[PDB]
Amino acid sequence: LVKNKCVNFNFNGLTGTGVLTESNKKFLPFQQFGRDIADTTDAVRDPQ
């Protein structure tokens, strides 16, 4: 994974385009995604 550049990313079929940055969202285990109001992923967990 390359960070801080626009990329087309595909995490477990969840696809999209955007800038991936290191995050301070302290979400507890067995949680994978985040969500905004429009219910589109805002943060994600690296599978590997």
Write out the residues near other proteins by the rule CB under 8 A: 13, 15-16, 37-40
Q: Pick between residue 22 and residue 39 the one whose CB is nearest to other proteins.
A: 39
Smallest gap from Cβ 38 to other proteins, in A, equals 5
Q: Pick between residue 16 and residue 21 the one whose CB is nearest to other proteins.
A: 16
3-state secondary structure 14-28: EEEEEECCCCCCCCC
**Phi-psi group of 12: left, alpha or beta (phi > 0 → left; psi -120 to 50 → alpha; rest → beta):** left
Residue 17, phi then psi, degrees to nearest 5: -130, 135
Q: Pick between residue 8 and residue 24 the one whose CB is nearest to other proteins.
A: 8
